[PDB]
Amino acid sequence: APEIARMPASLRESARKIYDSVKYRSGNESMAMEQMTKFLKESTYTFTGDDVDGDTVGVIPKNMMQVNSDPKSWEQGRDILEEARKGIIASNPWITNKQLTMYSQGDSIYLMDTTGQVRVRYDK
Amino acid sequence: APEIARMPASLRESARKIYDSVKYRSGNESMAMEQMTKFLKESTYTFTGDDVDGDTVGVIPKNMMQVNSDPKSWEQGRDILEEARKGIIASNPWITNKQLTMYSQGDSIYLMDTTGQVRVRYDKELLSKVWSENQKKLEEKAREKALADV
Amino acid sequence: DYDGLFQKAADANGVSYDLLRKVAWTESRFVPTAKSKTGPLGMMQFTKATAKALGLRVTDGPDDDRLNPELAINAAAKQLAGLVGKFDGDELKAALAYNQGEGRLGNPQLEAYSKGDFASISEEGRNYMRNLLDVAKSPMAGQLETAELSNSVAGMAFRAGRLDNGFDVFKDTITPTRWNSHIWTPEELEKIRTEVKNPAYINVVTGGSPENLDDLIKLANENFENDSRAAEAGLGAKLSAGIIGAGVDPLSYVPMVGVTGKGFKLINKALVVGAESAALNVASEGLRTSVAGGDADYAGAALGGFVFGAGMSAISDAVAAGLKRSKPEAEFDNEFIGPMMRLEARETARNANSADLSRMNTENMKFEGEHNGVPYEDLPTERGAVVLHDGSVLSASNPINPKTLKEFSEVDPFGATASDIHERLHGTDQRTYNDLYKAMSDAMKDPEFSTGGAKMSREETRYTIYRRAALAIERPELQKALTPSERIVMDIIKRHFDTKRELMENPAIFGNTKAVSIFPESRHKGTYVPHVYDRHAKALMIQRYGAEGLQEGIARSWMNSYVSRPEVKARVDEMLKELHGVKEVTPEMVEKYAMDKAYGISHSDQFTNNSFLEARNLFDSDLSITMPDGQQFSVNDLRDFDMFRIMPAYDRRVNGDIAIMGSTGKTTKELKDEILALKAKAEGDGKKTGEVHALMDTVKILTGRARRNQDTVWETSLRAINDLGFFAKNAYMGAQNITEIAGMIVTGNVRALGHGIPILRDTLYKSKPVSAKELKELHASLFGKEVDQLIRPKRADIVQRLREATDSPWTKLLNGTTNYLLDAARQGMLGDVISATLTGKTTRWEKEGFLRGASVTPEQMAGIKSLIKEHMFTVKDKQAFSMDPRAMDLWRLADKVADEAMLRPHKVSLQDSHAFGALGKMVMQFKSFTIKSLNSKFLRTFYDGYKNNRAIDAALSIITSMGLAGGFYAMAAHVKAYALPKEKRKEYLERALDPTMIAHAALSRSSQLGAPLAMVDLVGGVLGFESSKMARSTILPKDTVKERDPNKPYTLMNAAGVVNSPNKATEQDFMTGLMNSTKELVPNDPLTQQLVLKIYEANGV
Amino acid sequence: NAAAKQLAGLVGKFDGDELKAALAYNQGEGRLGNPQLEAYSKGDFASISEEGRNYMRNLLDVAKSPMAGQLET
Amino acid sequence: LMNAAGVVNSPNKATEQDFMTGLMNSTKELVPNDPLTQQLVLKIYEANGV
Amino acid sequence: SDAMKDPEFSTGGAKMSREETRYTIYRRAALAIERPELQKALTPSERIVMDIIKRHFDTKRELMENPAIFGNTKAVSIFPES
């Protein structure tokens, strides 16, 4: 699942923790998972591609693309970043395909195509 | 977690106990770490660096920074040790905070830049008694201009 | 006088070093002899303590008046070390006990001290005790006592800290633990080898954990069980999928001890596009390799490459924000995200069998190129780089990208034939070198050498394996007692030399049927290991009983074996009868023969066209005869080993002689005469006689003089990988990833060690124009590295034994970096001694109390020998300059000073940063960086937890290797620049000092010691023989030079298999060659990588 | 063989959708063409042109892209 | 152990391990190893007297 | 000391002891050396004494046949019947 795979980066450690707790409580692993997936899913937004597949490009954690204080700032940032990613894809697409991915380092929604051609850093 | 990893020494010798004790109680190995970490928090300041990282430079035990005999004093003394650690960093330019470590021992608060060159000791007796006289005559000045109103 | 003696006396039997210096200063004020009011006449001022103290320790003493310059210092150091031991880790009481006496009046005071500083102590007592309020570290030292007049917080700090002034990086950081620093008892090795599964875990001690080894076995087995159960799953799984893309830092991560490999294949989920499961051919597959472990050495490298690359990316993002606080943006690209992502994609394509998404595309055009065949193209992007025809892009600062290779080779400091024989031999001997390297890397890791505390390491840990593998071959009883994981190197050495022997006795196993037995003495049946005697071992023996001593010793040592065996007594007489004499052989005949054949080794340094097979004197050299001074003297001590300057320097001569033999006949007489007699006959005016000089060159190349060429490993690997990309599309990606990690590690080391170390940051790596007067220092610094390589004893068991025969800054721990720093600071000290003495004078060294191994007369001589041979100063470099009996005293002076002053204080200081020398300060600041890193938060918390003085060794070894690599290239760069036209053409100076070339210069240079076998011996494809075709074709009509030309050029192993082997290569051959020759610069144990990581990031970028 | 390898890469570089590989070859990979290759990724469309869509339709035989069932209609 | 070639090569004084094993061996004939015969000798002495 | 402690001599009730329990080990280690069939039937923890005795006497033999393995090159074969 886009979310469970890939991983936000930061989240893994907690995500794992949310898992164990639920497994010890009610001991159904599937139940635990549905209480881990819900959590990764609240936490991150899986940017998706314009193509009809539609394969994911990245999962960026919903915290670090927040703009002003209210969480609706995450919502607003989603727009800047999407306009940019059609910024990147429309600026000299020597080749794009799925080659372009974007993610978060410890604190930076870096977008980079596989190669050194286009690395963009967007920071909170 | 800074405090547990750099465990200051005396407290490490105690530390071993609390963990083994709490574990034998109800479901453990998180509750155990939980109690051990909350205890080490109740018992050692972590001296953080001025840099924005901000990586820790030391764990010096909240019992041995005590000026005089009460723990409000430990607090007051932290205000001596920080002034000391700061004067060093600016005074010898190039000793960026990342470089400095504060390392205790049995009973001594010791302070080193990584190159072995600069290294100031700080001890219960002298820290205590210097702070005692300093507070004394500063409080004298305080009385002086406080009674000057009357 | 002077502290050099204290440095060596205080590192033995104790002790806080500065204590001895302070005691000497106070008790003597630095006067060699002495007298006192109370009676004592000496430096440490003892007259009562003469007999008892001298007797009680390591060295004894003789009279009252003869209080010795060293025997007394060591005796007093032992007494003070006991006083430190006899009471506690409270050195101040030891000082008080010495000053006031132990047991007289004094003894009450020593007890009185035990109650607080007090007053029971007296006028000299308390004051002298207070004088040593420096290091260290008694409670009473804080208890003895007890702007300027301000309150205000500052004030309190100022009046309490009280600067200590002492620090031993070896009591407060790495403390020698019990298990480490234990040489292994010869019996305990037998237990470790049988009851430990992998010896690497004998080091890690979480405890604990004595005593004893019967507990360390139980721990290093249970930890190996705990490892392969979980460490593997956790690490592999976590990093396997999405190392970058995921992606983590990892800058704050567990020390990562357990992981080795193992289950790490990075199939990044995503970045896989078309996943054709199967195959493109029978090639591809996976790493096409021929060593076992080939899929784990690679894996190890990768975990260590990926972790380090992602960490460099995270730390460059962190230093970016660390510079954002000054200005918001300059350009900051910065960083390796490009190379690391294009490496992760390549790894995913390698493991997932398709989808090379790390391929730039495409156009154009493929100009200019082109170093060797491959045409590249420059991408306007991150500095560099090239793009291939695929085009798999090669990051700049890589050993492959042909733009960088050019830039570096640019401005910087019927039956047939002979050539077919040369290629068959160079294609099979590279394979046997690789098989030998595998077994050596597998043996130099057995417990004896590594698990325990360091002993001989590490240039000696291969020498004392090749010594065993040679002495087991020559006499086979000694064999029988050799470790198995090590017998497989003796087997391969014996088979290789036996195949060369079986092929030289009858080199007609080729086109021709003439050419008979090049070999020197067939019938002497044994694997002949090449007897190549050493220069410096002969020097040591000609220093005492110089000429006739050795000339008679090497004679009688053979005469011993001549009568000590019943079969050599036969095979010597079988040779003597044939030369001169009827059946009965007089014992005078053998005496004259042995004398005259030992004279060849006595006087003329023939052994260190014609060859050195000739020294295969029929006698056996195993028994030692007694010299008139007592020392037993063999010949194997004159001999050499180490298969490093021996095996690949013997194989080339043998392959040259074999090929010239297979052409028509003998190398010397025949070839030479004929080639010359075409020269001196046809002729000066002849236009086509330069084409005869062309064939003389064929001869030289084939024979193996080779014109010191084999320019680089990498210019070969470039075309190798270019052609490998055609057939094998999986090894293509593998060989790109390994070399890319190789380039990334070194380009990280350049940045870090450029920001962190002072001499490198503001001058050596500085762009331009010129260091004003440091030219006179750069010349001497480079001349030092020249003279060291010209003089140093080319062995391993003759350097450390000569160094310790006089008895990070301490070779007992982290020996890897100490070896490099010793063999570095020594050239600086040596060049300083030469330049100072030269013309003009500065005699800091002549007046030294470090006068050991150099007396007044030898020191003075080391001066005239230096003055006679150079002038303000690359001068000689002369044969007589090396064959000088007094010249070894210079080497010894230099090394002893470099191990007494520059590299054995337990603290870095301000000793020589406003003094000598240019390289001296560089190595001093390298030691300073080593201590600074070794005090970091990451590394100190990793040592305390796990000990493992071998991991931080393998970490701080690579750093210093690549650092001295960059340094020795940068220093030469400025000199070459100052030789470029002085009309400033320093744009050229700029073209050669940049991290895209320094990272390369720190690869194809910079030994890189100790490594089994060599970087060049493992890859190389000597190609042409273009001018040879020129000669053949153009002299086709001409006379008889043709008749010679169709001879030389074209247009495990038994002697029968070498001929059958193909004459170019195999894909597996070059694959294992590359996978082996890179283990000396990209390690395997993936935790030393992440240690290097935190060492770099703590320092900066 | 060289063109077969290029087309096998085009089949590999995108997906098991050979029709896009054919379109990428005919209209170029990366020039004018590269918008079309991306445009294809949104349905057969009209962002594609006179020779592009017709040539892509000519290869409505083997195989087996989703857009091959989606080109018509 | 020793072949005829090794006797000549051996040093002509001693090794610390040599005298060590010599002393540790030559005393087993007057200080036993099995530590219970010692405490038997003990009770034999103490029953007798001093 | 490692052989005179095997079961034959000690575990059971006393038999030849003890000045004889070394004599009847050296007797075996000498009679196995001189005729080698008898060898083949000797206890292992005891064969290591026959091995060392044989090697010691063989080294003295190999050194007496040609005692010139020393400074001099004269002095020929002190041994009685090579």
Side-chain angles (χ1 to χ4, degrees), chain F residues 48-65:
Chain F
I48 57 157
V49 71
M50 188 272 318
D51 205 357
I52 293 191
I53 291 172
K54 197 182 74 187
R55 182 54 56 74
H56 166 54
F57 283 125
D58 211 322
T59 304
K60 295 305 177 178
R61 161 77 168 287
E62 293 154 80
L63 202 151
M64 292 189 65
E65 299 169 27

Side-chain angles (χ1 to χ4, degrees), chain B residues 6 52 56 80 83-84 99 103 110 112 114-117 119-123 125-126 130-131 134 137-138, chain C residues 137 142-143 145-146 151 153-154 156-157 159-161 163-164 166-167 172 325 909 932 935 937 940-941:
Chain B
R6 313 285 281 105
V52 299
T56 78
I80 280 182
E83 183 65 13
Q99 269 38 261
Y103 130 93
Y110 239 104
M112 62 164 78
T114 37
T115 73
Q117 303 162 331
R119 199 191 192 192
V120 269
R121 209 193 293 103
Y122 277 97
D123 110 73
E125 177 163 32
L126 234 117
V130 166
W131 179 96
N134 178 312
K137 11 158 245 175
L138 177 63
Chain C
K137 293 179 179 179
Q143 185 62 254
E145 289 291 329
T146 180
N151 293 321
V153 316
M156 290 141 158
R159 39 187 191 267
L163 262 164
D164 215 11
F167 178 59
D172 306 338
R325 295 176 64 186
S909 299
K932 153 184 310 170
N935 255 325
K937 183 178 179 180
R940 186 180 170 277
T941 49

Side-chain angles (χ1 to χ4, degrees), chain C residues 113-327:
Chain C
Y113 161 108
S114 312
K115 312 180 199 180
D117 241 81
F118 267 27
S120 308
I121 312 174
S122 43
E123 213 169 272
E124 63 185 3
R126 187 211 292 101
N127 193 1
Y128 176 75
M129 175 184 164
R130 183 190 288 128
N131 266 349
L132 281 64
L133 267 183
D134 62 354
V135 48
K137 293 179 179 179
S138 49
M140 301 298 171
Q143 185 62 254
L144 191 153
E145 289 291 329
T146 180
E148 299 77 14
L149 43 143
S150 167
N151 293 321
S152 79
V153 316
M156 290 141 158
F158 180 86
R159 39 187 191 267
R162 304 223 108 245
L163 262 164
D164 215 11
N165 220 222
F167 178 59
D168 274 16
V169 58
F170 274 79
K171 295 172 171 301
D172 306 338
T173 83
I174 44 183
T175 57
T177 175
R178 247 294 290 177
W179 282 119
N180 291 155
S181 89
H182 200 68
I183 41 168
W184 276 138
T185 80
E187 196 280 334
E188 276 203 292
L189 289 170
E190 193 269 357
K191 188 178 296 192
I192 279 177
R193 273 164 190 165
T194 177
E195 299 211 332
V196 179
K197 301 185 190 299
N198 281 319
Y201 288 171
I202 308 292
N203 268 345
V204 167
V205 298
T206 72
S209 75
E211 289 295 7
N212 44 308
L213 193 139
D214 308 283
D215 173 36
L216 266 292
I217 284 184
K218 205 176 319 296
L219 273 190
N221 274 339
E222 280 219 339
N223 288 340
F224 185 65
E225 307 287 341
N226 194 351
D227 186 307
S228 277
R229 270 172 186 165
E232 42 109 353
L235 220 264
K238 301 168 63 175
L239 302 194
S240 168
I243 195 53
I244 299 193
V248 42
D249 294 332
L251 272 191
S252 317
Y253 223 83
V254 177
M256 209 200 297
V257 156
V259 67
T260 43
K262 181 178 73 68
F264 175 70
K265 272 193 163 201
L266 209 307
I267 313 180
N268 191 0
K269 203 50 76 181
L271 268 61
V272 183
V273 164
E276 216 89 11
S277 60
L280 308 98
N281 241 201
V282 287
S284 178
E285 308 303 322
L287 215 65
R288 289 274 305 162
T289 206
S290 66
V291 260
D295 230 27
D297 50 0
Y298 180 68
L303 207 137
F306 273 122
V307 165
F308 173 75
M312 286 302 282
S313 89
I315 191 54
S316 160
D317 280 332
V319 70
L323 288 175
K324 301 251 182 213
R325 295 176 64 186
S326 177
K327 306 192 68 168

Side-chain angles (χ1 to χ4, degrees), chain C residues 795-935:
Chain C
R795 264 177 84 188
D797 282 331
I798 198 170
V799 55
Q800 205 79 276
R801 194 161 280 174
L802 162 60
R803 178 175 308 139
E804 282 306 82
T806 318
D807 287 31
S808 312
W810 186 218
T811 179
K812 193 156 286 308
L813 305 181
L814 64 160
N815 207 294
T817 175
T818 298
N819 291 297
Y820 287 120
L821 293 190
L822 259 192
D823 308 291
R826 61 172 312 156
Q827 290 93 8
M829 189 62 56
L830 187 143
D832 275 346
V833 160
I834 311 186
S835 89
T837 317
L838 224 51
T839 117
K841 203 152 57 179
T842 299
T843 37
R844 151 67 170 168
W845 319 114
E846 171 169 333
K847 188 164 187 174
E848 242 178 337
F850 297 34
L851 35 60
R852 298 210 57 184
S855 176
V856 185
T857 310
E859 161 71 45
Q860 258 281 2
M861 289 275 184
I864 180 65
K865 198 204 76 73
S866 197
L867 187 150
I868 185 169
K869 248 80 82 174
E870 32 262 351
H871 191 273
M872 226 83 59
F873 25 86
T874 49
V875 193
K876 312 193 297 299
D877 205 9
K878 178 64 76 171
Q879 213 59 43
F881 184 94
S882 194
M883 297 189 216
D884 196 350
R886 67 159 66 100
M888 298 327 100
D889 284 352
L890 177 78
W891 181 103
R892 195 161 61 194
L893 184 154
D895 190 54
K896 183 190 183 69
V897 173
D899 218 359
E900 193 154 289
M902 284 301 181
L903 187 43
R904 202 188 276 179
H906 295 215
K907 71 210 92 183
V908 197
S909 299
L910 186 53
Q911 59 91 33
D912 274 359
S913 177
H914 286 174
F916 296 167
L919 192 148
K921 64 208 304 185
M922 168 187 298
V923 302
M924 177 65 46
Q925 279 140 7
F926 262 102
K927 172 173 162 296
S928 198
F929 160 77
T930 308
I931 281 183
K932 153 184 310 170
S933 155
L934 195 146
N935 255 325

Side-chain angles (χ1 to χ4, degrees), chain C residues 568-618:
Chain C
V568 74
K569 195 261 168 200
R571 70 166 176 188
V572 180
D573 304 352
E574 192 177 309
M575 177 53 170
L576 275 182
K577 294 168 190 170
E578 189 165 3
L579 292 177
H580 172 258
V582 187
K583 277 78 70 178
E584 282 206 296
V585 171
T586 296
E588 191 176 349
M589 294 278 320
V590 57
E591 272 290 329
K592 181 50 178 291
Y593 167 86
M595 201 62 65
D596 201 67
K597 252 186 182 63
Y599 173 78
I601 306 103
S602 174
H603 287 52
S604 200
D605 181 17
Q606 293 174 354
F607 319 123
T608 187
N609 292 346
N610 211 5
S611 67
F612 90 122
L613 277 140
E614 205 230 344
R616 193 183 170 259
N617 299 33
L618 199 149

Side-chain angles (χ1 to χ4, degrees), chain B residues 34-119:
Chain B
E34 235 219 347
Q35 284 293 149
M36 184 174 73
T37 189
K38 170 284 348 176
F39 158 76
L40 291 176
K41 271 293 278 287
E42 265 193 41
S43 196
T44 44
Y45 192 50
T46 317
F47 274 63
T48 61
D50 44 284
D51 62 283
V52 299
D53 280 30
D55 54 328
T56 78
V57 299
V59 191
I60 306 276
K62 203 189 289 175
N63 180 313
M64 70 164 317
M65 297 188 303
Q66 278 179 220
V67 192
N68 69 72
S69 296
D70 305 335
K72 269 71 210 65
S73 326
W74 129 63
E75 183 159 1
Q76 290 212 224
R78 192 245 330 270
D79 305 341
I80 280 182
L81 218 49
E82 288 287 332
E83 183 65 13
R85 190 194 50 70
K86 201 65 50 67
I88 297 309
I89 297 192
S91 173
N92 294 53
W94 82 55
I95 301 192
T96 63
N97 183 272
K98 296 181 274 74
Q99 269 38 261
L100 221 58
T101 316
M102 334 187 74
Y103 130 93
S104 63
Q105 199 56 45
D107 179 18
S108 289
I109 298 153
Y110 239 104
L111 164 58
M112 62 164 78
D113 97 75
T114 37
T115 73
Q117 303 162 331
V118 184
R119 199 191 192 192

